[PDB]
Design an enzyme around this catalytic site. Structure first.
Site, mmCIF file in Angstrom:
data_model
loop_
_atom_site.group_PDB
_atom_site.id
_atom_site.type_symbol
_atom_site.label_atom_id
_atom_site.label_comp_id
_atom_site.label_asym_id
_atom_site.label_seq_id
_atom_site.Cartn_x
_atom_site.Cartn_y
_atom_site.Cartn_z
ATOM 1 N N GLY A 180 -2.794 8.794 -0.781
ATOM 2 C CA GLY A 180 -2.186 7.574 -1.026
ATOM 3 C C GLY A 180 -1.180 7.762 -2.520
ATOM 4 N N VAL A 189 0.983 -1.330 -0.158
ATOM 5 C CA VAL A 189 -0.149 -0.181 -0.094
ATOM 6 C C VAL A 189 0.781 1.438 -0.016
ATOM 7 C CG1 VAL A 189 -2.223 -1.035 0.929
ATOM 8 C CG2 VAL A 189 -0.320 -0.201 2.404
ATOM 9 N N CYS A 190 0.259 2.398 -0.472
ATOM 10 C CA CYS A 190 1.045 3.676 -0.480
ATOM 11 C C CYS A 190 0.572 4.760 0.320
ATOM 12 C CB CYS A 190 0.941 4.120 -1.947
ATOM 13 S SG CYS A 190 2.199 5.351 -2.401
ATOM 14 N N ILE A 191 0.365 4.253 1.582
ATOM 15 C CA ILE A 191 -0.183 5.149 2.810
ATOM 16 C C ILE A 191 1.094 6.097 2.788
ATOM 17 C CG2 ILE A 191 -0.424 5.542 5.189
ATOM 18 C CD1 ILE A 191 -3.009 4.936 3.355
#
Ligand SMILES: [Zn+2]
Ligand SMILES: [Zn+2]
Ligand SMILES: [Zn+2]
Lengths: 89, 629, 597, 78, 187, 97, 75, 85
Positions: free
Chosen positions: G75, E87-89
């Site tokens: 994000g 994920v790219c939090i």
């Protein structure tokens, strides 16, 4: 604590037991019917004389000397000495 | 004559050599003149000029050994009932003879035999190995069954004291191990199979019969010593008859039979024994049952049940009226007695200390069907009774030993939280009023508790201790502020204050009564508040009216009195200061609190009747008719 | 002629002036005429031709496109360089127009290689042949049509050249065109009566165009007819597989597979089934071709199913004959290995290696390159799990390859190729020794290495595997701690397995001599106390001690007296003084004194 | 009438802001730091209504300055 | 005995209570408190009716100072996730500036972030992603196409339905009802 | 230091060592231990020196560079019987072809 | 109305602004209650992030719900 | 229609790139402008790279963007290359 070795012409050589126990054949003797004269009917005097000197040299310069000088061996006895050292060890 | 190769006849030489080898194998006499002469004959044969004769020498030696072995076997089998007495006689000669005659053929072993099969894994072999192989042939294709049967019959003389020839059976059995020349991988297979199989089977059968015979006409008490004596004799018997590598198997089979065939018989008596003392009889059963794979849990369970029952009997019944000291004393007595018993008779086995711990845990946290586990309350009562010591009855050193012992019992309670709150409250009540046994002992309390349970258990007590330790220093170093207040000080009341934390001290009840404050107390409070705020800021200092106790020194009656009294009755007396007669209405309006507390204070005043009554508007008055010490 | 070939050396003031002993002054595989005609030195070429024209056709060595080429005539080099002036100067002077190189390379081929049209027309207008091919039989038309060059192709075709010119591998010019697009030459050749023929592996040119990845010629051949449904279906699936494998486009793969399956289903009367094997492949995750249009939609979410489908399609359509299939399988395995997962890479490479060995000749660079991939993988995975079965299997396949190679009837395999296999095997044995195991597998390892040693292999300079085990040049493979040969452990396993300790190389160098040349006295001691000979003599009159450096003799790690007997001294004296011994002493002693020479 | 000579009393104190817990090291404000618990240090304050730790706020001050809830500034004074 | 283990054990024994939607701390052996395992119930009104998405959280050595990592075992199609469940939090980035977003407005790691807030942030991103920085361009493109189409193209809906059906079968098999009633979801 | 010696009479040869340069009485005692003869009934001939039997071997000429073990040195011997001593009879070794 | 919004600290503090207020009002109220700037805080109801431009009547939370706030992220 | 480029020198270069373009076209434009080698030039936008062969329109690049060109077991295999040629 000494052994006696008799050549094929008459001369008798007395050498210490620990020195003489280097050759495997001599160890094969002196261990059998009993536990001190060993008679060789083939070895001439000029080879049996040098064999004892080799025994002394090997026992003395075993693992101690840093530089060991070469063993003097004339070329007039080489053929017989090879066979003598083959019969013994 | 010279060491040069030459043509050899091989007809006179072999006839010459046959006489010497025959006299050497049979351990006869050979002089040193011919033993050395026979050397170099093999050398001449090995270096024959055309087509050397090493293979012919090997073949003829093999044939000679075959004939000799067959003749020896013929003689041994010909004689009858003297077997195993001549086998040793003909093996002692043969082994030494082969060892000696291997030395004669040193040249043929060194050269022409060294070219055998390398370590890649019958075609070629050395000469001593060949002789041992020939004797193996004697031992396998001819007699094996008769030898094994007679050996087993001789060993079977166990019940009787008939001693067989020890120097014969041992030699015969050890002769089987001599396959050492071909012992590259498996040196004990021959002996293992041939002797170890029927000996083990016969031992199992015989000891089954012996166990049945012993159990037929014996009890379960004069049985452990009998089987132990049989086992002790077995090892010394096996030492002088078998190989060093076959003791564990025989002893294990014997144990398996005698013990593991009758483990159900021993369990009823293990139940019976534990209830009584029978100190000697437990060691025998423990030693016997340590060998069987699964026999110990029954004894462990029985011991746990016995300990639990004894502890319950010792603790529950002996209740007296109300004492918490007998609880700890009885638990300590039970623990010490059984620890001593286990250490002195069971050789310190770890599997039973767990049973002791489980049973003690069960007995220390017992709960009634209609009651809570009342362990921690009595533990805390023992704690403060052991620590108050404001009155005589103990010492200053035995307390530490009592505490060190007490930590052992403390390590067993399941619910330590309620103990923590109880000790917090009761230590608080002990600490505020300053009746503790001097100091440097509550530190031992806190240190031991922290070492036993942890830090989060003792977090809320060390800070209470530090608060009490620093309040005195603060008072001592702050009282000079009155002197250094520039203007004169008119505070006529001696002062000693305590500064308490918020969450450390578990008496944070929310106030609900706004009681009035005495006259000089107003100025004292103002001075203290301003000075404390100047010393440090960022804190609101609440006031509690239910622990502040002062004293009143009265000299108006014939006997002056000192009353160490809390602030309620001082407020009452200050209300009574203005007029000798004060009614209930002005008593109520001089302060502001629940009327129950005021009624309780008035009733307590009338209990010794320092005041009198002449409700809603009842008028009380000062009572000069009451005197005391 | 020192600087004349060292530099271009125009020097019309001096070099022009200087019997003409330098008429054919050539050295180092090069001649002055080659350099004169190589860099367009018109004055130098004229001077050389006027001085002596006898060496006009002399060819030497030259490196034009990086690599050196031997036997290059000046006309061939001049045609490639594009220097027109030297070209027709030599043509007028009378140079031979078909002087092929050492590889049957015509100057016309070099001319069309780079695209010099004017030189091409001038050469072919001067009585030049057209049907002369190289050693591999690749004509000039195929090379010209490989590149774009769509101006010389038409002129050469108008010159009257053939178009059906199968080489040894049976590759036409249509294959060369299809390998690099070029739809214009497609149209021209198709117009001039071209035929559609297969090749050695059985590839239609459309299949080759789908393999290389081009998307225009495949559409052209989808049109133009003379193709059944099966050919177009196979071409489309191969195009999708190549899109997935070579490039990394996936929506286009979806579109192509969708149209292919729609065409496959077509009408109810003509429905084509999907030929599938009855077996399930372990390395393929037991997948199968989706024979349903409904299963096609929604496949974009999971890429791994697409990788398996593409691999299966490529394996079915082409076959194990091609190296492309094995290469792509190993490529997918390496991609997964780089993705951090190591479990499936081993299985994929195992299947790839199994396919490779059962299809191709022994000792080839492809199957050789396959083994170092496993070597690096096991080196990394050991480096900060590993199963015995995988390492044992890969070692077994390596030994099988060695046996099949050495059992060749003529046995022409050079030791240079075998050296890589031997080094890979030794590194594998080390990596295996760095892993714990059980008893039965240990015995299996011992038996396999026993068979490998008794196979009697040889290497560079006639080296035994024991020789390579005690050399510092063996560890050229990899760069990680692969125990950095020489090593005690590998030598110990080889010795206890049964490796002979007294073998000889081409220079009669025993393993002790190699060890001494690489120092390491512990290996020397281990070999000595195993049956080796201390006083051996190589081709020269040198022993194992005389090759030692100063450190070994200073530290005194080898004591000579303990391993020297009186026989040795007697034999040395007999040899040195040249005494006649035959017929006077035992035979074994004669062999001994021959050894101690 | 009556009188008094000496008076003793006790009192409780607490910081008059939130009496909350440290949001960085996740413990009650009147408690030791975890690094301190590995074995006396005080408690810091901020210009905001938020009251932070001392060792936690120093450790994060080695990286940034402002309130971890308010990326504005830091005072450290009171 | 270190600050990381103390913080994680404190958070676990505080988390023994009942959060709202995403809370299933599975069998952590407590020998290594850094490795966790959480399950996501799914929102009641978004595209994930009654799912069960097992996850994995790895906690670094300096928990209050360094951010953790979040991974998804079951593969979904989300325009802000990688192929291997990553994920790219933004919160999980170390504090350093090369232009990504505004450092000051809480777009990076601060010590006042706990496992709870991390979980709610994950659910919020799962409900509403961004198209400014795709993590996978195919899902980004179909996200944009469906968002502009307002339900005309339903390929994303179909694949999401298939995935949630599979995970719902797994959830119903294992132990849990996977609530979607808009009432049992709230705690 | 450690010198090495050969003591020969007729067809006899005894191999023995010495410490550094010791009293010839010690060598005579070793010879007596080998052969059971009285030390006062011996002469211990050098080539022509007769080796006066009271001194050390260092002045007798036996050095560490002359009595190496790879090629020992020789010392004669002649017991003096009740009548008189011998004529120093030492036989030589055989002649090798 | 009255809503006990869960805060970062483990002790919720109730808010009783009015049943049909705006997210701007809610953020301002929690800001003055705790100190978190509105540009920094972000509110979650049940998994659906609530935008700041709408009104509370569009979510139908009744009168005993719970909102869990989080820091803003993308994000 | 015009976006900037942040090179290693920090100079902003305006490039007229339409959405119907590609990473290869952008690389060709930057090679025309400066001549950076393709084997060395990198593309990083918003902290993550731009995939080759992917159009920038699908990458959501708007006006006044910003890109950086910071310099930057395994696949140690090569395709077969054995022919005459
Ligand atoms: Zn803190
Ligand atoms: Zn601290
Ligand atoms: Zn703040």
């Amino acid at each position: 604590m000494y052994v006696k070795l008799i050549s094929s012409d008459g001369h008798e050589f007395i050498v210490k037991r620990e020195h003489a126990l280097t050759s495997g054949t001599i160890k094969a003797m002196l261990s059998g019917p009993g536990q001190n004269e060993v008679n060789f009917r083939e070895i001439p005097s000029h080879v049996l004389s040098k064999v004892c000197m080799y025994f002394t040299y090997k026992v003395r310069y075993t693992n101690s000397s840093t530089e060991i000088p070469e063993f003097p061996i004339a070329p007039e006895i080489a053929l017989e000495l090879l066979m003598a050292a083959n019969f013994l060890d | 004559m010279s060491l040069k190769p030459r043509v050899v006849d091989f007809d006179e030489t072999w006839n010459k050599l046959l006489t010497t080898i025959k006299a050497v194998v049979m351990l006869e006499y050979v002089e040193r003149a011919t033993w050395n002469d026979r050397f170099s004959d093999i050398y001449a044969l090995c270096v024959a000029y055309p087509e050397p004769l090493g293979e012919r020498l090997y073949t003829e030696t093999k044939i000679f050994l075959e004939n000799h072995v067959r003749h020896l076997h013929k003689r041994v089998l010909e004689s009858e009932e003297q077997v195993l007495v001549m086998y040793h006689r003909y093996w002692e000669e043969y082994s030494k003879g082969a060892d000696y005659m291997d030395c004669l053929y040193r040249y043929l072993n060194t050269q022409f035999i060294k070219k055998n099969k390398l370590t890649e894994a019958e075609p070629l072999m050395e000469i001593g190995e060949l002789a041992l192989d020939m004797w193996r042939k004697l031992m396998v294709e001819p007699l094996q069954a008769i030898l094994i049967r007679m050996l087993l019959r001789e060993i079977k003389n166990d019940r009787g004291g008939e001693d067989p020839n020890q120097k014969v059976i041992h030699g015969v059995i050890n002769s089987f191990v001599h396959v050492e020349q071909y012992k590259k991988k498996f040196p004990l297979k021959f002996y293992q199979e041939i002797f170890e199989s029927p000996f083990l089977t016969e031992t199992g059968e015989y000891y089954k019969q012996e166990a049945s015979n012993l159990l037929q006409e014996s009890n379960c008490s004069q049985y452990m010593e009998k089987v132990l004596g049989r086992l002790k004799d077995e090892e010394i018997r096996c030492r002088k008859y078998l190989h060093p590598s076959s003791y564990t198997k025989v002893i294990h089979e014997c144990q398996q039979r005698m013990v593991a065939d009758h483990l159900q018989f021993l369990h009823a008596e293990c139940h019976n024994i534990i209830r009584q003392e029978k100190k000697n009889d437990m060691a025998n059963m423990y030693v016997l049952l340590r060998a069987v794979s699964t026999g110990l849990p029954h004894m462990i369970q029985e011991l746990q049940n016995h300990i639990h029952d004894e502890g319950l009997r010792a603790t529950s019944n002996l209740t007296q009226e109300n004492m918490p000291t007998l609880f700890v004393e009885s638990v300590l007595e039970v623990h010490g007695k059984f620890v001593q018993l286990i250490n002195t008779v069971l050789n310190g086995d770890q599997h039973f200390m767990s049973a002791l711990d489980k049973a003690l845990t069960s007995v220390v946290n017992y709960r009634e069907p209609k009651s809570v586990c009342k362990a921690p309350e009595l533990l805390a009562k023992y704690c403060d009774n052991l620590l108050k010591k404001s009155a005589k009855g103990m010492t200053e050193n035995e307390v530490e030993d009592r505490l060190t012992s007490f930590i052992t019992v403390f390590k067993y309670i399941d619910d330590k939280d309620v103990f923590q709150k109880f000790y917090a409250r009761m230590l608080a009540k002990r600490l505020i009023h300053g009746l503790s046994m001097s100091m440097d002992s509550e530190e031992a309390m806190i240190n031991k508790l922290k070492q036993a349970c942890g830090y989060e258990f003792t977090s809320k007590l060390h800070r209470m201790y530090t608060d009490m330790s620093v309040s005195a220093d603060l008072n001592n170093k702050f009282n000079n502020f009155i002197k250094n207040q520039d203007t004169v000080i008119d505070l006529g009341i001696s002062f000693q204050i305590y500064v308490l934390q918020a969450g450390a001290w578990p008496l944070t009840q929310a106030p609900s009564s706004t009681f009035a404050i005495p006259q000089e107390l107003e100025k004292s409070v103002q001075m203290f508040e301003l000075f404390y705020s100047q010393h440090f800021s960022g804190r609101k200092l609440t006031w509690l009216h239910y622990l502040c106790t002062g004293e009143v020194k009265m000299n108006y009656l014939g006997k002056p009195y000192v009353a160490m009294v809390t602030t309620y009755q001082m407020a009452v007396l200050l209300a009574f200061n203005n007029s000798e007669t004060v009614s209930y209405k002005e008593l109520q309006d001089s302060t502001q609190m629940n009327e129950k507390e005021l009624t309780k204070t008035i009733k307590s005043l009338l209990d010794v009747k320092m005041i009198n009554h002449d409700d809603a508007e009842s008028s009380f008055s000062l009572n000069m008719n009451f005197s005391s010490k | 002629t020192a600087v004349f070939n060292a530099a271009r050396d125009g020097k019309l003031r001096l070099l022009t002036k200087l019997v003409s002993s330098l008429i054919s002054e050539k050295t180092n595989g090069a001649t002055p005429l080659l350099m004169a005609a190589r860099y367009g030195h018109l004055d130098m070429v004229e001077f050389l031709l006027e001085q002596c024209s006898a060496s006009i056709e002399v060819g030497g060595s030259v490196n034009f496109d990086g690599e050196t080429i031997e036997g290059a005539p000046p006309l061939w080099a001049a045609s490639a360089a594009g220097h027109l002036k030297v070209v027709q100067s030599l043509l007028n002077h009378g140079a031979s127009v078909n002087n092929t190189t050492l590889t049957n390379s015509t100057p016309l081929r070099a001319a069309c290689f780079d695209g010099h049209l004017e030189i091409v027309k001038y050469l072919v207008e001067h009585k030049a042949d057209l049907e002369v091919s190289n050693r591999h039989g690749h004509t000039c038309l195929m090379i010209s049509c490989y590149k774009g060059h769509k101006e010389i192709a038409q002129y050469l075709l108008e010159k009257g050249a053939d178009v059906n010119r199968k080489s040894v591998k049976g590759n036409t010019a249509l294959h060369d065109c299809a390998e690099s697009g070029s739809l214009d030459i497609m149209k021209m050749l198709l117009m001039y009566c071209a035929k559609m023929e297969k090749d050695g592996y059985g590839m239609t040119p459309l299949l080759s165009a789908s393999v290389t990845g081009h998307t225009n010629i495949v559409d052209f051949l989808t049109h133009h007819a003379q193709t059944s449904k099966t050919e177009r279906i196979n071409a489309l699936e191969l195009l999708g597989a190549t899109f997935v494998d070579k490039k990394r486009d996936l929506l286009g793969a979806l579109k192509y597979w969708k149209k292919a399956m729609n065409m496959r289903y077509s009408d109810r009367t003509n429905i084509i089934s999907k030929p599938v094997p009855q077996t399930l492949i372990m390395a393929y995750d037991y997948a199968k071709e989706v024979n349903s249009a409904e299963e096609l939609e929604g496949l974009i979410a999971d890429p791994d199913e697409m990788r398996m489908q593409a691999l299966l399609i490529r394996e079915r359509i082409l076959g194990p004959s091609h190296p492309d299939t094995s290469y792509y399988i190993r490529y997918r395995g390496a991609v997964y290995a780089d993705s951090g997962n190591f479990k499936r890479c081993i299985n994929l490479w195992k299947y790839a290696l199994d396919m490779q060995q059962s299809n191709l000749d022994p000792l080839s660079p492809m199957t050789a390159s396959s083994l170092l991939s496993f070597a690096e993988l096991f080196s990394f995975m050991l480096q900060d799990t590993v199963t015995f079965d995988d390492l044992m299997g890969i070692l077994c396949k390596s030994v099988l390859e060695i046996e099949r190679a050495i059992k060749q009837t003529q046995c022409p395999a050079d030791p240079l190729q075998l050296n890589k296999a031997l080094s890979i095997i030794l590194h594998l044995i080390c990596l295996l020794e760095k892993v714990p195991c059980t008893l039965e597998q240990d015995h299996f390892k011992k038996q396999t290495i026993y068979r490998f040693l008794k196979l009697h292999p040889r290497g560079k300079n006639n080296f035994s595997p024991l020789h390579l085990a005690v050399d510092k040049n063996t560890t050229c493979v990899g760069r990680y701690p692969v125990c950095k040969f020489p090593s005690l452990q590998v030598t110990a396993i080889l010795i206890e397995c049964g490796a002979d300790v007294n073998v000889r190389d081409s220079d009669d160098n025993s393993p002790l001599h190699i060890a001494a040349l690489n120092n390491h006295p512990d290996i020397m001691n281990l070999l000595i106390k195993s049956g080796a000979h201390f006083d051996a003599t190589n081709l020269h009159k040198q022993t194992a001690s005389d090759l030692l450096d100063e450190k070994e003799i200073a530290k005194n790690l080898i004591q000579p007296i303990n391993h020297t007997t009186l026989q040795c001294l007697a034999a040395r004296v007999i040899v040195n003084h040249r005494i006649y011994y035959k017929g006077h002493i035992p035979e074994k002693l004669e062999t001994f004194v021959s050894l101690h020479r | 009438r009556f009188e008094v000579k000496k008076w003793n009393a006790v009192a409780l104190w607490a910081w008059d802001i939130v009496v909350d817990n440290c949001a960085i090291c996740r413990n009650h404000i009147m408690d030791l730091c975890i690094e301190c618990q590995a074995n006396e240090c005080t408690v810091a304050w901020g210009v905001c209504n938020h009251a932070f730790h001392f060792h936690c706020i120093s450790r994060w001050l080695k990286t940034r300055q402002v309130c971890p809830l308010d990326n504005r500034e830091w005072e450290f004074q009171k | 005995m270190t600050s990381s283990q103390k913080a994680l054990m404190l958070e676990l024994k505080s988390l023994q209570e009942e959060p709202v939607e995403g809370f299933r701390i599975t069998l952590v052996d407590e020998s290594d408190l850094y490795n966790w395992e959480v399950a996501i119930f799914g929102p009641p009104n978004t595209l994930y009716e009654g799912g069960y998405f097992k996850a994995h959280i790895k906690f670094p050595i300096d928990y209050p100072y360094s951010p953790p990592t979040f991974r998804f075992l079951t593969k979904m199609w989300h325009p802000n996730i990688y192929e291997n469940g990553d994920v790219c939090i933004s919160i999980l980035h170390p504090p350093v500036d090369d232009p990504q977003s505004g450092e000051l407005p809480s777009e990076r790691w601060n010590p006042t972030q706990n496992v709870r807030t991390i979980l709610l942030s994950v659910i919020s991103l799962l409900n509403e992603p961004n198209t400014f920085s795709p993590a996978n361009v195919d899902a980004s493109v179909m996200f944009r196409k469906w968002r502009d189409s307002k339900g005309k193209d339903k390929e994303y809906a179909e694949i999401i339905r298939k995935q949630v059906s599979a995970t719902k079968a797994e959830a119903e098999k294992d132990g849990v009802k996977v609530p979607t009633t808009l009432a049992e979801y709230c705690i | 230091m450690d010198v090495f010696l050969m003591i020969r009479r007729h067809k006899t040869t005894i191999f023995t060592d010495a410490k550094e340069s010791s009293t010839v009485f010690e060598l005579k005692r070793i010879v007596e231990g080998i052969l059971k003869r009285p030390p006062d009934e011996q002469r211990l001939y050098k080539d022509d020196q007769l080796l006066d039997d009271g001194k050390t071997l260092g002045e007798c000429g036996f050095t560490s560079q002359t009595a190496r073990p790879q090629a020992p040195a020789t010392v004669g011997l002649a017991f003096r019987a009740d009548d008189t001593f011998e004529a120093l009879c030492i036989e030589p070794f055989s002649s090798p072809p | 109305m009255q809503i006990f919004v869960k805060t970062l600290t483990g002790k919720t503090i109730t808010l009783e602004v009015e049943p049909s207020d705006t997210i701007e009002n809610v953020k301002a109220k929690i800001q003055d209650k705790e100190g978190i700037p509105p540009d920094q805080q972000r509110l979650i109801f049940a998994g659906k992030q609530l935008e700041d431009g709408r009104t509370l009547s569009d979510y139908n939370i009744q009168k005993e719900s719970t909102l869990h706030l989080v820091l803003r992220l993308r994000g």
